Amino acid sequence: VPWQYFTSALWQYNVALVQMLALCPTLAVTTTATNGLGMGLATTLVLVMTNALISSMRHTISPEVRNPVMIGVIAGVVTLTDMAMNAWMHELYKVLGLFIALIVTNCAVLGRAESFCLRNPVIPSILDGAGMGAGFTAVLVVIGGIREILGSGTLFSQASSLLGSHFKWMEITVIPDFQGILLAILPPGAFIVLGFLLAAKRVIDRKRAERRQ
Amino acid sequence: EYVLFLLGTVLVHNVVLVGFLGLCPFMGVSSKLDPSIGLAVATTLVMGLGGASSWLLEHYVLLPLGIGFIRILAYIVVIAGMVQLIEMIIRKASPSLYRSLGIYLPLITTNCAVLGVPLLSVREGHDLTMAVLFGLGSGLGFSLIMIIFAGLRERLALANVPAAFSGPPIAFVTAGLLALAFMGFGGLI
Amino acid sequence: RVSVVYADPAKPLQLSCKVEDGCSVEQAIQQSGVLRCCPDIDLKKQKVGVFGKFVKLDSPLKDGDRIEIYQ
Amino acid sequence: SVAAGPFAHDRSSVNRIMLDVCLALTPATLFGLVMFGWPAINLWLVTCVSALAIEAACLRLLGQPMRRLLDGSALLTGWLLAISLPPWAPWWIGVGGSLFAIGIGKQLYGGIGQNPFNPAMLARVALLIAFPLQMTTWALPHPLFSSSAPGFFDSLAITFAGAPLADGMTGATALGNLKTELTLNRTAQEILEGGFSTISALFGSTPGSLGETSELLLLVGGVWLVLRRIIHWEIPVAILASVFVMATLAYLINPERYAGGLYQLTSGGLILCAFFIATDPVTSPISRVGRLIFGVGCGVLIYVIRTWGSFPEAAAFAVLFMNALTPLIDRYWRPRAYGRNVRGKPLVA
Amino acid sequence: FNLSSIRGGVHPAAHKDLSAALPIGSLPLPPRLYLPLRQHAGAEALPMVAVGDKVLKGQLLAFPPTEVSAPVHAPTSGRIVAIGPVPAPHPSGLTTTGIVLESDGEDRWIDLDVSTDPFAEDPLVLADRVAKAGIVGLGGAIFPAAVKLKQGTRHEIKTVLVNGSECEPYLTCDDRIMRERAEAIVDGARLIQHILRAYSVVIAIEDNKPEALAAMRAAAEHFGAIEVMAVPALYPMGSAKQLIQAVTGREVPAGGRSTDVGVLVHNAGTVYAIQQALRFGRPLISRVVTVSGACVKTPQNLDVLIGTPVQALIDACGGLSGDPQQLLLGGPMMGAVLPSTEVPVIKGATGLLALARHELPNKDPAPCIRCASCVDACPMGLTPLDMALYARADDYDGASEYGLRDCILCGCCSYVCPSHIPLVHYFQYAKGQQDERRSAARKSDYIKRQTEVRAARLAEEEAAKAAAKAAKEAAK
Amino acid sequence: WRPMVAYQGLSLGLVCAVVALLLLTGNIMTHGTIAEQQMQDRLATLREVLPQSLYDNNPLADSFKVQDAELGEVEVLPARLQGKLTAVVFQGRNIGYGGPIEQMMSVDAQGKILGVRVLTHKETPGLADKIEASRSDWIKVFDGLSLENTALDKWKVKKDGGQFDQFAGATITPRAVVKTVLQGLQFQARHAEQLKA
Amino acid sequence: IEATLALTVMGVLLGCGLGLAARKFGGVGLAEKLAAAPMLARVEASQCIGCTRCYRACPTDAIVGASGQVHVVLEDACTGCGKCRDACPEDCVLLIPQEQTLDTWRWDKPAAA
Numbered sequence A: 001v002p003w004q005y006f007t008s009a010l011w012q013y014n015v016a017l018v019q020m021l022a023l024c025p026t027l028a029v030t031t032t033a034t035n036g037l038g039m040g041l042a043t044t045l046v047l048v049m050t051n052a053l054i055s056s057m058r059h060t061i062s063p064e065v066r067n068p069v070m071i072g073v074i075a076g077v078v079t080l081t082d083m084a085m086n087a088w089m090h091e092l093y094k095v096l097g098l099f100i101a102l103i104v105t106n107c108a109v110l111g112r113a114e115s116f117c118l119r120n121p122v123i124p125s126i127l128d129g130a131g132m133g134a135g136f137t138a139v140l141v142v143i144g145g146i147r148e149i150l151g152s153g154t155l156f157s158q159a160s161s162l163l164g165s166h167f168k169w170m171e172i173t174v175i176p177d178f179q180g181i182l183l184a185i186l187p188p189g190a191f192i193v194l195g196f197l198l199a200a201k202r203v204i205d206r207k208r209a210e211r212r213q
Numbered sequence B: 001e002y003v004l005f006l007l008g009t010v011l012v013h014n015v016v017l018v019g020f021l022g023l024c025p026f027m028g029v030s031s032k033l034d035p036s037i038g039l040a041v042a043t044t045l046v047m048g049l050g051g052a053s054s055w056l057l058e059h060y061v062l063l064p065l066g067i068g069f070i071r072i073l074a075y076i077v078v079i080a081g082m083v084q085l086i087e088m089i090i091r092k093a094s095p096s097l098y099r100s101l102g103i104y105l106p107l108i109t110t111n112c113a114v115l116g117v118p119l120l121s122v123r124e125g126h127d128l129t130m131a132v133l134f135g136l137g138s139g140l141g142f143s144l145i146m147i148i149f150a151g152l153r154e155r156l157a158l159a160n161v162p163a164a165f166s167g168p169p170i171a172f173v174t175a176g177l178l179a180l181a182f183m184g185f186g187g188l189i
Numbered sequence C: 001r002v003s004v005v006y007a008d009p010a011k012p013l014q015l016s017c018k019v020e021d022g023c024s025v026e027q028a029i030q031q032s033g034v035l036r037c038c039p040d041i042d043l044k045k046q047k048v049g050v051f052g053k054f055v056k057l058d059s060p061l062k063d064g065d066r067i068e069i070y071q
Numbered sequence D: 001s002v003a004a005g006p007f008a009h010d011r012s013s014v015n016r017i018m019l020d021v022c023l024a025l026t027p028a029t030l031f032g033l034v035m036f037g038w039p040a041i042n043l044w045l046v047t048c049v050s051a052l053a054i055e056a057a058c059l060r061l062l063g064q065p066m067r068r069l070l071d072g073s074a075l076l077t078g079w080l081l082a083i084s085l086p087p088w089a090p091w092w093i094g095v096g097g098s099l100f101a102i103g104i105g106k107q108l109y110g111g112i113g114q115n116p117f118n119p120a121m122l123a124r125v126a127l128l129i130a131f132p133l134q135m136t137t138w139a140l141p142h143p144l145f146s147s148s149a150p151g152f153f154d155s156l157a158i159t160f161a162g163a164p165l166a167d168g169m170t171g172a173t174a175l176g177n178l179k180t181e182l183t184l185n186r187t188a189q190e191i192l193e194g195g196f197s198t199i200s201a202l203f204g205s206t207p208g209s210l211g212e213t214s215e216l217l218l219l220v221g222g223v224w225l226v227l228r229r230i231i232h233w234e235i236p237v238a239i240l241a242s243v244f245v246m247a248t249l250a251y252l253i254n255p256e257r258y259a260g261g262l263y264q265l266t267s268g269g270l271i272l273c274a275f276f277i278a279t280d281p282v283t284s285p286i287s288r289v290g291r292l293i294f295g296v297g298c299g300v301l302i303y304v305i306r307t308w309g310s311f312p313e314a315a316a317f318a319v320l321f322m323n324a325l326t327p328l329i330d331r332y333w334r335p336r337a338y339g340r341n342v343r344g345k346p347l348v349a
Numbered sequence E: 001f002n003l004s005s006i007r008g009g010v011h012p013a014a015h016k017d018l019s020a021a022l023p024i025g026s027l028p029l030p031p032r033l034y035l036p037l038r039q040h041a042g043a044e045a046l047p048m049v050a051v052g053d054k055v056l057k058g059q060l061l062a063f064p065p066t067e068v069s070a071p072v073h074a075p076t077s078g079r080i081v082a083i084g085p086v087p088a089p090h091p092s093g094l095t096t097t098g099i100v101l102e103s104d105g106e107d108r109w110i111d112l113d114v115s116t117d118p119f120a121e122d123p124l125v126l127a128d129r130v131a132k133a134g135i136v137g138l139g140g141a142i143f144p145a146a147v148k149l150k151q152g153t154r155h156e157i158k159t160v161l162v163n164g165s166e167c168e169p170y171l172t173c174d175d176r177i178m179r180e181r182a183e184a185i186v187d188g189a190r191l192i193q194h195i196l197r198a199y200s201v202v203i204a205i206e207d208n209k210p211e212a213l214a215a216m217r218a219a220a221e222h223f224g225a226i227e228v229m230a231v232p233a234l235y236p237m238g239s240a241k242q243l244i245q246a247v248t249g250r251e252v253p254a255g256g257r258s259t260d261v262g263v264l265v266h267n268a269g270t271v272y273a274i275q276q277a278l279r280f281g282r283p284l285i286s287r288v289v290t291v292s293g294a295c296v297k298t299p300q301n302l303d304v305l306i307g308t309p310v311q312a313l314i315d316a317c318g319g320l321s322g323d324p325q326q327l328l329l330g331g332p333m334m335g336a337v338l339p340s341t342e343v344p345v346i347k348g349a350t351g352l353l354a355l356a357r358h359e360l361p362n363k364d365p366a367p368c369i370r371c372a373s374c375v376d377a378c379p380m381g382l383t384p385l386d387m388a389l390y391a392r393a394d395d396y397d398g399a400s401e402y403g404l405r406d407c408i409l410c411g412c413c414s415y416v417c418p419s420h421i422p423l424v425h426y427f428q429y430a431k432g433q434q435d436e437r438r439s440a441a442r443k444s445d446y447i448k449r450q451t452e453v454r455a456a457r458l459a460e461e462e463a464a465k466a467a468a469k470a471a472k473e474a475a476k
Numbered sequence F: 001w002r003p004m005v006a007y008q009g010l011s012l013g014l015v016c017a018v019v020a021l022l023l024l025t026g027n028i029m030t031h032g033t034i035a036e037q038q039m040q041d042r043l044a045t046l047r048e049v050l051p052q053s054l055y056d057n058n059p060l061a062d063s064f065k066v067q068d069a070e071l072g073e074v075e076v077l078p079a080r081l082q083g084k085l086t087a088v089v090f091q092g093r094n095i096g097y098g099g100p101i102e103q104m105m106s107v108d109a110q111g112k113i114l115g116v117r118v119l120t121h122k123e124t125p126g127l128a129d130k131i132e133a134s135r136s137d138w139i140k141v142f143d144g145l146s147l148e149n150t151a152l153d154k155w156k157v158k159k160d161g162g163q164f165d166q167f168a169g170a171t172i173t174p175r176a177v178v179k180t181v182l183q184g185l186q187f188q189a190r191h192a193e194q195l196k197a
Numbered sequence G: 001i002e003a004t005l006a007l008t009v010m011g012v013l014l015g016c017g018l019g020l021a022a023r024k025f026g027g028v029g030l031a032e033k034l035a036a037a038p039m040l041a042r043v044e045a046s047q048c049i050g051c052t053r054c055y056r057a058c059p060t061d062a063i064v065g066a067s068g069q070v071h072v073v074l075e076d077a078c079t080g081c082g083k084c085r086d087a088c089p090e091d092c093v094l095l096i097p098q099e100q101t102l103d104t105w106r107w108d109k110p111a112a113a
């Protein structure tokens, strides 16, 4: 079933939680849940489009120059994405800054483009890209939410100004009247949260295996 | 002066602890010291060459022709090509040398640092000398951090870490504490 | 340089002795000292073999041979 | 199961070492507590008790024997963090510091002997980064039973809850004062002529941390520790010599901008870090050349970030950096074997 | 010369003053002796007698099968009753091949082959005379003395060092053997100096034995090149590698013998045994052991025949005055826990300490705190903590890099460990695993070579026979 | 085919040509919108210190460039209602604690300050972040002051003997901000006519 | 246009260079990976009739002996490969695990800390 890849990529093979890939945007743009959600959505789009293009162009890539070809097929797309979200989502583009342009070197993008998109049809590749993007977005949202709660208490702040007023329903407040711990926003707070998330993933995997047994 | 610039790049503005660039190979290979040293040397050379080539391409081709938005593409493409040559040229010329630089070279074809550094340098308007120095300093910072982290993880491998934290998670926690330690150099240069 | 083996199932003995080239099985066994290890060895009665072939006491032996005394 | 030798021992124990370190710290801690009054006592007790409780909880979680609580490795960390803190600090500062040290810095790595970083200094850096306002408010010396220091319940309101310290009870220390007045285009000489006395700063009659103030009782305790063979003189001697030499050279070059020697030594937690904190065995080199390199690096970093840095004192940062550098020092400066050269090849005779 | 200073070492409680007062005692002949056939290093000797034979005191019961071995002589006249399994002085408690001799009680000497003017024959003759005497180096290493002397002859020896610096706690056998028999030890040193053409002998005693020093200086004062030296009172000082550094000042190269620096080391009991063998022809039959500990009524030194059960030694010294928490065969720093009291006394037995509860320290292992007190105490200049870390993780190859090869298991590690860690136990386990791997590899190589040779010879024989048969039928 | 090197070169050239064509089409589509967004961002930043009613012409169209003796070269943006200057907006920089602070001033035509906002700073968060208008009203103190009703003795922090409050545990940053404001007012006073009106 | 031609020239130059270099001279996760009881024979005293089949089928020189009623016996060279098990018509080979002896004794690892 084609839907198997989309479900399996979420937790069994997570880009930033199992394969140890896409760590730069995972740690950098994650001081707020909104930043994580925006970066995840952009990466998911880019992944879907690049997977579709590579799979449609699968039987033409010379084996020895496969990288600079496919990299180009990525790079231009990424460029367009930049020139899109700098023009009609400028508020979010100012926040992400460099890491929206740094999707070409995203290890998850090239890894999925090379490993899966060169030996699968267009539909399975599109579904795999969608699944990887969804897992990446979920991880980014979780990390950003934890860091934002520890730093300011609020969850999903200024979503209306970044993602449009339609998402104004997402601005929720946890721990009202909280100055927050400043270290969570700072770089030292990202590695610790990621390590704790990995430890929690290992613990819940062991417990789920025990329950299944 | 340039010594202060290089020291600021290495310590004050470290490409990993305060830049979050090139973290996947950094976290994947730092379990052993010797591959860490090899990758450090390889990535320093690659970043220097990529910075020089990117500056030449930007200031001699892109800007005079008027196309600047293309730069990203062009940049990475050139870098990719260079890396491939620097692999194959060192896989027949000196087979002995294909054990310290050639083996780890494919790991840094797309690293986010070999591309993050030129894009950052463009915004500062560096000249050719400053661009090459910026690339070399970023490579040196990456190398030093990777070597220290490799030593720490090699010692932790023989320690009694809890079974729910042994491996990658303890490495991430250690990297966070190391960034906290490096945070004291802020504002020095 | 040869070896002498006693195939006694109770106690399998194996010794290594250097003998002059062109020696005989009799002198090789006498030099190897297996007689003093086990006084119940009859060199005229029990079978003496080389690598599983019954041989003669004064038959010449080459280097790397294995004299064996058994039933 | 057979038992293996040797069947003799010198009656050593980690409990004795940690308790002797605490005993060496005792006089300076008493001097600090008497000088600052009841709020210092409240903060110190809270920090130590919270450290012990959190250590017990972490031991319970990991299943380690509870007897590990009796070796004093947690009480010592709590003691050092408490004497490193500002005197009239709120309780949650000490509790959070204890939680961040005993916990992430020590117990998350397995326990005593496994962590790669100094727990107390890790907590100190984390507290300074996270809460800069509470960690940069220094209370003037209000000696216990002096008719001007707050009473018992007033001190309770000062430490627990959030009663403001009023006015005239907080002043600037020495290093921060020098840096600020330098930013006020005043040369380094006029600032020290009318704003610093070496005799009183050496005794400990100046604002500062809880136990850092006195650079004399700390020296006595460190010397006693050296004589008891608990620590090695290499690290303290190297740190102090490096700081003094660099400061003296800077003073001799440009006397109107740099202050060095006695001023650098008798200010900040330099002596406390040199004797009691940089000499942590678990996070220091095991060689002699390694310890010398560790001390020299600590001193150089301390002086550099003191003078040209953005901090008034960087003992914690220097200690953390050298703790990071320690494993390479251990693996590249091993002692020479018996019957072998430095490279490890067998000797030839 | 002048004493140098060794690196590392500890000062454990000597406990030598409660036993080095009474003279060397004697033992009534026990009913039966158990003589293991392997009381030495290297190959095991092969028995020459059968069950029921009558032997005399000094008969050669077992003979060496190869060059590196030592014979076993009958301690007393009697009848052989078993050539089978006997209990062994080992911590494991397993049995070993050995003879059981029923002591007749007559105690009649065999017709010994005495020499004539030992300072007249070439060194090889004296070396083989020592070889046919059972001298095994009563120092702990139980390495045959004949092989050591023969290896010494080939090189150039500039000094014969007599290892009289008894350093183990509770042990005083060397002290009494030097107080009472200084003349014999000096004569043996002169005989060894004749065997190995050397310059001088430098008999060394620790400074906590003033009586031994005075007796030795009184005995050796007319012979010239003989010297008496007073080495410091340090624990790992009796070791050959450390004593050589203390005396000469050089260091024995790693993976090399003491003849490289031109020094030969012999124990103070081995020298006396060599003197006895050369002057009178008496083989190695009895030695001197020390019975001490808080659980023995009267600590003493006993002249014990080889193969005597331990229970007889304990009964001789009054008896167990209480409950012995531990029984050790040797010093507390290198001893082995005896399984039972029926264990015999091999040539390498040095003491039988009966330690009570208040002499044994209590230990509660705790994680290593990296205090580096091990590095300051290791005589070989190693890093014990790293070796323990690698041995606990079963990384023997990495452990050997940090000095597991050069470790001598002296015990100075665990003696100064704040968090009580069985460092020597870890090192012994790691060395055992390495030796097991090495033995397995050696067996694999040997069996593969044997298969190759057997297949090749069988194939060539078959081919030659086939060719001969083909030649025969052609002429038919 | 993947054979002769001609295929590799032709494939890479075709990929580059197609990508370049797409990128140039996208750029010609969106560069005007990007420039409009940047201009709107600049106007939004300006509008926080300059109320709409005061100015009629476009402030970001008649930018001056005045050279003084201390600040160097400035970027005075005028706000003329009907051929008459009513407000001048410029920027000041001065060394703080963590580095230079860049701020904006909106002095009216008579010397009254209409509002000051801090653009770029690297002060310690949680200790000297109150200079921002989104967290504290301290930066809103300067709103009616001038060189007339405030002599050259109250233009300092209270630590130095002035009238402006200092942050609890942070005085260097308020010193720098007040010095920048005073220097801007004195610079306006020096250059008459064009800037003064 | 003047830019597409330049980009195409750079692309064809890179392609030709890579092709010529390949003539003359995956995944990140996989690339990281690249960078980073015995038994012995046994012969009783009755089941061997000297049929010399065990020696006949034994690549190792373990069984020693020939002829009849000689009671051929093994050595230390055995590896339990079983080439003599089926060889014996009377089923004399009795492969057994190796027993523990004093010379094959090793110290046990300490329990824990």
Ligand SMILES: CCCCCCCCCCCCO[C@@H]1O[C@H](CO)[C@@H](O[C@H]2O[C@H](CO)[C@@H](O)[C@H](O)[C@H]2O)[C@H](O)[C@H]1O
Residues within 6 Å of the ligand: A175, A176, A177, A178, D050, D053, D095
């Ligand atoms: C060994 C360590 C033991 C720790 C023991 C902790 C005991 C005290 C509990 C923590 C403090 C609870 O006291 C807290 O007071 C504040 C105001 O003062 C109020 O709480 C309010 O502010 C706090 C500030 O973080 C937030 O929870 C929130 O914004 C709001 O609830 C409540 O009254 C109570 O949540």
Ligand SMILES: CCCCCCCCCCCCO[C@@H]1O[C@H](CO)[C@@H](O[C@H]2O[C@H](CO)[C@@H](O)[C@H](O)[C@H]2O)[C@H](O)[C@H]1O
Residues within 6 Å of the ligand: A196, A199, A200, A203, B162, B163, B164, B165, D061, D062, D063
């Ligand atoms: C919202 C909470 C999120 C938590 C995120 C951080 C992850 C923490 C979970 C893993 C922590 C490891 O810490 C601790 O590890 C030990 C390993 O000895 C586990 O195991 C421990 O408890 C279990 C019972 O559950 C015992 O059977 C076991 O003998 C004991 O070791 C614990 O269950 C875990 O609590």
Ligand SMILES: CCCCCCCCCCCCO[C@@H]1O[C@H](CO)[C@@H](O[C@H]2O[C@H](CO)[C@@H](O)[C@H](O)[C@H]2O)[C@H](O)[C@H]1O
Residues within 6 Å of the ligand: D153, D156, D157, D158, D160, D161
């Ligand atoms: C062992 C339990 C845990 C110890 C650690 C936690 C201790 C925390 C102390 C809580 C203090 C609460 O804060 C403090 O409360 C006390 C009562 O106790 C108030 O004290 C009040 O009652 C006392 C009598 O009891 C009066 O003399 C006093 O004038 C009045 O103010 C203080 O004005 C207030 O500052």
Ligand SMILES: CCCCCCCCCCCCO[C@@H]1O[C@H](CO)[C@@H](O[C@H]2O[C@H](CO)[C@@H](O)[C@H](O)[C@H]2O)[C@H](O)[C@H]1O
Residues within 6 Å of the ligand: D046, D049, D050, D091, D095, D160, D161, D162
């Ligand atoms: C390991 C040691 C742990 C140290 C724990 C210290 C806890 C200290 C808590 C003190 C109380 C919290 O702070 C206080 O909260 C309450 C409101 O909730 C109010 O305080 C009031 O109620 C509290 C109980 O709730 C009373 O104990 C107190 O005497 C009274 O004044 C004050 O507004 C605020 O000062």
Ligand SMILES: CCCCCCCCCCCCO[C@@H]1O[C@H](CO)[C@@H](O[C@H]2O[C@H](CO)[C@@H](O)[C@H](O)[C@H]2O)[C@H](O)[C@H]1O
Residues within 6 Å of the ligand: A179, A180, A181, A183, D092, D095, D096, D097, D099, D100, D126, D127, D130, D160, D161, D162, D163
């Ligand atoms: C970063 C490493 C260390 C991590 C430490 C763990 C977190 C510890 C708590 C940090 C909370 C910071 O937020 C802090 O919350 C405390 C409550 O605790 C508030 O404290 C408030 O309530 C407490 C009682 O609960 C009163 O005693 C106090 O006077 C009042 O201000 C502080 O005004 C606020 O600054």
Ligand SMILES: CCCCCCCCCCCCO[C@@H]1O[C@H](CO)[C@@H](O[C@H]2O[C@H](CO)[C@@H](O)[C@H](O)[C@H]2O)[C@H](O)[C@H]1O
Residues within 6 Å of the ligand: D027, D028, D030, D031, D034, D035, D141, D143, D200, D204, D205, D206, D217
């Ligand atoms: C067991 C170890 C020894 C235990 C010692 C216990 C007693 C120690 C008491 C020392 C504290 C009181 O000693 C001193 O008191 C005075 C008040 O008169 C404080 O303050 C005063 O003296 C200082 C000294 O320059 C001046 O700034 C000024 O005159 C005033 O502030 C001092 O800062 C403090 O150093």
Ligand SMILES: CCCCCCCCCCCCO[C@@H]1O[C@H](CO)[C@@H](O[C@H]2O[C@H](CO)[C@@H](O)[C@H](O)[C@H]2O)[C@H](O)[C@H]1O
Residues within 6 Å of the ligand: D246, D249, D250, D253, D254
């Ligand atoms: C390497 C290990 C440590 C060595 C010791 C370190 C001591 C501290 C560093 C001393 C650095 C002094 O730093 C340097 O001082 C000189 C003084 O000549 C200053 O120099 C200034 O004053 C001198 C006169 O004194 C003028 O001639 C010169 O034109 C002017 O620039 C430099 O601007 C400054 O860069």
Ligand SMILES: CCCCCCCCCCCCO[C@@H]1O[C@H](CO)[C@@H](O[C@H]2O[C@H](CO)[C@@H](O)[C@H](O)[C@H]2O)[C@H](O)[C@H]1O
Residues within 6 Å of the ligand: D192, D240, D241, D244, D245, D248, D251, D252, D259, D260, D261, D262, D263
């Ligand atoms: C600590 C162990 C290592 C010892 C190493 C010693 C090496 C250097 C020895 C020569 C030191 C010369 O030290 C010199 O002493 C003078 C006073 O004499 C000190 O100077 C002191 O007094 C002057 C005014 O007189 C003050 O402005 C100054 O702040 C103060 O430090 C300086 O520190 C240094 O200029």
Ligand SMILES: CCCCCCCCCCCCO[C@@H]1O[C@H](CO)[C@@H](O[C@H]2O[C@H](CO)[C@@H](O)[C@H](O)[C@H]2O)[C@H](O)[C@H]1O
Residues within 6 Å of the ligand: B004, B007, B186, B187, B188, B189, D304, D307, D308, D309, D310, F097, F098, F099, F100
């Ligand atoms: C591993 C050993 C490293 C040894 C390092 C020795 C070099 C460091 C000392 C020489 C540099 C001194 O650096 C000098 O000091 C100040 C802070 O005081 C630095 O920093 C200054 O500028 C920067 C950038 O604007 C901002 O952080 C701020 O304005 C200020 O801190 C300056 O860039 C330089 O003027």
Ligand SMILES: Cc1cc2nc3c(=O)[nH]c(=O)nc-3n(C[C@H](O)[C@H](O)[C@H](O)COP(=O)(O)O)c2cc1C
Residues within 6 Å of the ligand: E136, E137, E138, E139, E140, E141, E142, E143, E148, E163, E164, E165, E166, E167, E168, E236, E238, E239, E240, E265, E266, E267, E268, E270, E334, E408, E409, E410
């Ligand atoms: C740890 C250790 C302890 C030793 N203790 C002694 C000792 O107490 N007495 C002694 O004579 N030799 C001692 N030696 C040295 C050997 O036991 C032996 O004397 C030397 O290697 C050769 O002497 P031999 O040939 O006379 O046995 C010790 C060696 C080591 C390694």
Ligand SMILES: Cc1cc2nc3c(=O)[nH]c(=O)nc-3n(C[C@H](O)[C@H](O)[C@H](O)CO)c2cc1C
Residues within 6 Å of the ligand: D017, D018, D021, D073, D074, D076, D077, D080, D106, D111, D112, D113, D114, D115, D117, D118, D119, D120, D121, D230, D231, D276, D277, D278, D279, D280, D281, D282, D283
């Ligand atoms: C001499 C000495 C110095 C110590 N210094 C520190 C220190 O600075 N910080 C700390 O948390 N523990 C310190 N300890 C306690 C012990 O080293 C600490 O528990 C280990 O770091 C735990 O891993 C010290 C102990 C000794 C004996």
Ligand code: SF4
Residues within 6 Å of the ligand: E367, E368, E369, E370, E371, E372, E373, E374, E375, E384, E385, E416, E417, E418, E419, E421
């Ligand atoms: S003596 Fe014990 S605690 Fe000290 S370093 Fe050695 S093993 Fe560690």
Ligand code: SF4
Residues within 6 Å of the ligand: E377, E378, E379, E380, E381, E382, E384, E406, E407, E408, E409, E410, E411, E412, E413, E424
């Ligand atoms: S047992 Fe080995 S490592 Fe330990 S002190 Fe003795 S020689 Fe050194």
Ligand code: SF4
Residues within 6 Å of the ligand: G043, G047, G048, G049, G050, G051, G052, G053, G054, G055, G072, G087, G088, G089, G090, G091, G092, G093
């Ligand atoms: S095969 Fe069996 S019967 Fe034949 S010789 Fe061998 S053991 Fe004896």
Ligand code: SF4
Residues within 6 Å of the ligand: G040, G041, G057, G058, G059, G060, G062, G063, G074, G077, G078, G079, G080, G081, G082, G083, G084, G085
């Ligand atoms: S099992 Fe194999 S090696 Fe062992 S005796 Fe039989 S045939 Fe020989």
Ligand code: FES
Residues within 6 Å of the ligand: A021, A022, A023, A024, A025, A105, A106, A107, A108, B021, B022, B023, B024, B025, B111, B112
């Ligand atoms: S290194 Fe940056 S995404 Fe992998």
